[PDB]
Amino acid sequence: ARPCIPKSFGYSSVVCVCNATYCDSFDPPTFPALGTFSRYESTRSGRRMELSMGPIQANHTGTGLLLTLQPEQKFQKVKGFGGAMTDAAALNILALSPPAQNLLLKSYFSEEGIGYNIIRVPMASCDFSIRTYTYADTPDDFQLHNFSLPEEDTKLKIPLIHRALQLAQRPVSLLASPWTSPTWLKTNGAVNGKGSLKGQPGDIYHQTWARYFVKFLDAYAEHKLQFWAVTAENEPSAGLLSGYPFQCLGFTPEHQRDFIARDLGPTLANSTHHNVRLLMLDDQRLLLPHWAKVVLTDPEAAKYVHGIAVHWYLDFLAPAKATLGETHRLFPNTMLFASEACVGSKFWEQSVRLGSWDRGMQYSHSIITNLLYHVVGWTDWNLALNPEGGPNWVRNFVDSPIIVDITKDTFYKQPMFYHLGHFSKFIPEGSQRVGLVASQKNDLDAVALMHPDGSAVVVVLNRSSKDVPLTIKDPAVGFLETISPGYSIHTYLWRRQ
Numbered sequence: 001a002r003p004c005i006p007k008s009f010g011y012s013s014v015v016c017v018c019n020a021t022y023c024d025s026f027d028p029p030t031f032p033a034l035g036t037f038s039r040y041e042s043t044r045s046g047r048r049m050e051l052s053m054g055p056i057q058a059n060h061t062g063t064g065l066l067l068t069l070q071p072e073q074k075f076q077k078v079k080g081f082g083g084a085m086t087d088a089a090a091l092n093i094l095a096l097s098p099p100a101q102n103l104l105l106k107s108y109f110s111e112e113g114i115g116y117n118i119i120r121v122p123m124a125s126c127d128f129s130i131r132t133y134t135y136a137d138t139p140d141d142f143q144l145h146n147f148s149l150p151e152e153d154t155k156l157k158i159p160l161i162h163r164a165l166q167l168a169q170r171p172v173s174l175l176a177s178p179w180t181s182p183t184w185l186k187t188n189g190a191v192n193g194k195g196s197l198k199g200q201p202g203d204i205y206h207q208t209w210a211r212y213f214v215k216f217l218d219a220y221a222e223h224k225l226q227f228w229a230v231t232a233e234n235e236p237s238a239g240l241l242s243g244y245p246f247q248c249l250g251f252t253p254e255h256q257r258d259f260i261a262r263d264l265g266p267t268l269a270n271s272t273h274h275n276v277r278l279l280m281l282d283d284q285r286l287l288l289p290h291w292a293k294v295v296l297t298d299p300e301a302a303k304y305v306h307g308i309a310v311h312w313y314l315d316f317l318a319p320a321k322a323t324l325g326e327t328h329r330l331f332p333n334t335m336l337f338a339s340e341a342c343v344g345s346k347f348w349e350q351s352v353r354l355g356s357w358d359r360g361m362q363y364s365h366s367i368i369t370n371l372l373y374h375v376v377g378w379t380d381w382n383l384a385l386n387p388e389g390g391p392n393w394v395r396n397f398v399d400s401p402i403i404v405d406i407t408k409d410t411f412y413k414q415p416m417f418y419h420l421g422h423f424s425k426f427i428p429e430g431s432q433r434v435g436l437v438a439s440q441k442n443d444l445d446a447v448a449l450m451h452p453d454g455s456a457v458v459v460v461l462n463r464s465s466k467d468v469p470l471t472i473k474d475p476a477v478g479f480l481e482t483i484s485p486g487y488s489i490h491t492y493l494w495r496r497q
């Protein structure tokens with residue numbers, strides 16, 4: 001419906017420029033008739049989710065690359081895709097004019113955008129905050145009579161979440177994660193630094209902390225918001241580290257095991273919020289499978305844990321098979337979920353690289369890797385940042401798919417936005433990953449899924465410089481003759497009878 005307005009900032013590709021009177025958008029979503037496929041294409045050279053259509057053919061000849069769909073080889077069901085409504089994201093979005101705010105939220109949450117259905121909500125402050133606070137800073141309030149939501153929630157985050165829900169046609173799921181407890185519950189009496197809950201699981205400190213989760217859910221429920229899931233702590237490994245610079249709360253895996261078994265599990269299960277899912281870990285993948293082993297081999301903890309949340313710092317290398325793969329092999333009934341991902345966090349790299357195709361490819365390659373290792377969903381970090389990658393009270397700046405420039409009442413949609421959208425827009429909740437078998441060695445990254453209504457979706461990423469002809473075979477339906485251009489990403493969709 002409206003094309004990308006491209007702008008270059010001297011990186012490898014372009015951003016798309018939106019403002020108070022213009023943003024790129026799609027027509028309302030429709031499928032091609034049976035016998036036709038849809039292709040959405042983005043390229044380093046500047047194409048941004050451009051739609052074209054082609055015939056599904058009865059016949060195929062040639063010794064070229066064939067990707068054969070395995071519709072009956074079924075893997076995980078997909079929860080969805082989204083990002084985080086941090087204080088920084090909320091401040092950046094609301095710093096735009098009301099029209100530009102609307103176009104930004106439509107970009108992420110509407111069917112005229114990329115159809116996000118997950119929002120992660122910090123429980124009080126984190127690094128992507130300008131004020132340090134918890135919901136219960138009054139000391140020694142063990143019954144949490146003075147628990148309350150400040151304006152960061154009631155004036156910024158909650159109204160924006162309500163606006164996102166109004167724009168979405170897909171049901172949206174909220175995920176909550178805490179960084180720190182009130183400091184009077186902590187061994188070090190500070191929001192940051194090395195420190196854990198005082199005492200031991202099953203005591204007043206741990207029971208008060210578990211009750212804070214219920215107070216949080218109660219408070220959001222008064223604002224007519226309900227949660228799909230909570231995590232047991234954002235990055236529990238970080239609070240074990242001397243000098244940790246921002247909000248944290250340290251748990252060893254044994255500590256998290258016992259806290260879930262004795263306090264958090266029982267407290268959530270006894271509340272009106274018993275249907276909220278509990279995700280463990282919420283941390284980097286090299287903690288697996290060890291953390292999963294420690295927690296899930298205790299039946300009293302295991303009975304409360306619905307899933308394992310993992311963080312992806314895309315700037316850094318770590319094994320996928322030995323972490324995610326091995327965890328799925330040992331614990332196939334406990335879903336894996338990616339709860340946070342980001343790029344640009346290395347001090348020596350520019351936090352925000354406007355128009356970086358490389359960072360876009362990092363996003364889509366990560367998502368493909370996650371989906372091929374059984375992960376049910378993928379959640380970006382901050383929904384929007386400023387050109388510095390902030391605000392952030394400890395200057396821990398990073399990149400974001402949307403960058404706001406308040407001085408021009410403008411926002412920029414990064415390659416990362418389109419790379420995420422190649423998945424989020426075209427993979428409804430309840431889709432199932434299926435197999436896809438390559439006929440020969442090749443340089444492409446790809447994943448196939450089946451929609452709840454039986455339709456097919458295939459994403460093909462080409463991180464190489466070479467255009468690669470290929471054929472996609474759907475054994476029931478026929479052949480898609482296509483090309484994967486160098487430095488491109490494509491999403492293919494078709495009906496199946």
Ligand SMILES: *[C@@H]1O[C@H](CO)[C@@H](O[C@@H]2O[C@H](CO)[C@@H](O)[C@H](O)[C@H]2NC(C)=O)[C@H](O)[C@H]1NC(C)=O
Pocket residue numbers: 005018019020021022
């Ligand atoms: C928002 O951005 C749009 C798109 O760049 C601006 O509209 C363009 O304005 C230039 C200069 O007049 C024209 O050459 C283009 O034809 C316009 N494009 C479109 C699609 O209208 C627009 O002026 C900006 N809005 C604000 C409020 O700054």
Ligand SMILES: *[C@@H]1O[C@H](CO)[C@@H](O[C@@H]2O[C@H](CO)[C@@H](O)[C@H](O)[C@H]2NC(C)=O)[C@H](O)[C@H]1NC(C)=O
Pocket residue numbers: 267270271
């Ligand atoms: C389990 O859930 C119920 C909520 O229905 C809790 O009962 C409340 O307990 C507090 C204790 O101060 C009372 O003031 C409330 O009046 C009770 N609510 C109702 C509706 O009667 C119960 O304490 C919970 N048990 C826990 C958390 O261990």
Ligand SMILES: CN(C[C@@H](N)c1ccccc1)S(=O)(=O)c1cc(F)cc(F)c1
Pocket residue numbers: 365368369372441442443444445446447
């Ligand atoms: C095995 N494939 C990737 C291979 N063709 C490839 C691509 C680029 C250079 C060298 C080899 S794959 O199945 O598409 C895949 C598996 C995976 F575990 C994570 C991926 F990102 C993608």
Ligand SMILES: *[C@@H]1O[C@H](CO)[C@@H](O)[C@H](O)[C@H]1NC(C)=O
Pocket residue numbers: 058059
């Ligand atoms: C497809 O292959 C069959 C078998 O040789 C042939 O009869 C048919 O005409 C071919 N062409 C088309 C367009 O289906």
Ligand SMILES: [K+]
Pocket residue numbers: 134135136137138146147148149
């Ligand atoms: K308070």
Ligand SMILES: [K+]
Pocket residue numbers: 344345346347348349350351397398
């Ligand atoms: K940086």
